[PDB]
């Protein structure tokens, strides 16, 4: 497996212009991003994917702001970034799934919105 440095939850308020949902693999050994695949899932849907072999990111139109920083994958960082509009209407549990060659793993993080 790919193993994760786990986080139970992250929180944001009206004050956040964007949000980050952390995802960190602790035993990544990738030499090139072509070897890597990432899926972020919400309520059973793939709301962000990165197919390294094609250098291709894919999001649905209701998560149009979702992205990762592809350059950080080789360090094991697959953290999701989105704008506050996509975030405030889609609070809940996010699954980060990473694959490197044949090794795979996933971790879950709850995105929580605090009303102030």
């Amino acid at each position: 497996q790919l193993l994760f440095n786990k986080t139970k939850s992250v929180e944001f308020t009206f004050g956040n212009d964007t949000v980050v949902i952390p995802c960190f693999v602790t035993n990544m050994e990738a030499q090139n991003t072509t070897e890597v695949y990432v899926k972020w899932k919400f309520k059973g849907r793939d709301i962000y994917t990165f197919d390294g072999a094609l250098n291709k990111s894919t999001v649905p139109t209701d998560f149009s702001s979702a992205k990762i920083e592809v350059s950080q994958l080789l360090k094991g960082d697959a953290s999701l970034k989105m704008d506050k509009s996509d975030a405030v209407s889609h609070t809940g549990n996010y699954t980060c799934e990473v694959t490197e060659l044949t090794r795979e793993g996933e971790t879950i993080i709850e995105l929580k919105y605090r009303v102030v």
Binding site: E29, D46, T102, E104, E106
Partner: protein, 116 residues
């Protein structure tokens, strides 16, 4: 270069009830990118027995250190065998996608269970 092979060297395995079963599988390549999974049976009603995701298969783990990038051994151990576990077990390579697709199957290993 040669095609990826999924090799299940044993056509059959016999286990005494209560013992652990070892089902062998190796791959000859780690690309194309995608996981290995084990099933009992084939076709649309087959049962997922193992993949590398943490906390899903309390009876099943890999024999070798499959947390290493270079690992090509996907052999598994299943604890506490009962007659209910008898069947044909397949080691299956997938390619990544939305959703993942079956790429190549091993030949299958028939597990027979010996009562009392």
């Amino acid at each position: 270069e040669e095609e990826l092979q999924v090799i299940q060297p044993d056509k059959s395995v016999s286990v005494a009830a209560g013992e652990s079963a070892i089902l062998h599988c190796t791959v000859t390549s780690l690309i194309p990118v995608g996981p290995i999974q084990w099933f009992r049976g084939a076709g649309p009603a087959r049962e997922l027995i193992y993949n590398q995701k943490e906390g899903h298969f309390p009876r099943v783990t890999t024999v070798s250190e499959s947390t290493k990038r270079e690992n090509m051994d996907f052999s598994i151990s299943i604890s506490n065998i009962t007659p209910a576990d008898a069947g044909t077990y397949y080691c299956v390579k997938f390619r990544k996608g939305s959703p993942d697709t079956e790429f190549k199957s091993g030949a299958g290993t028939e597990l027979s269970v010996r009562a009392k």
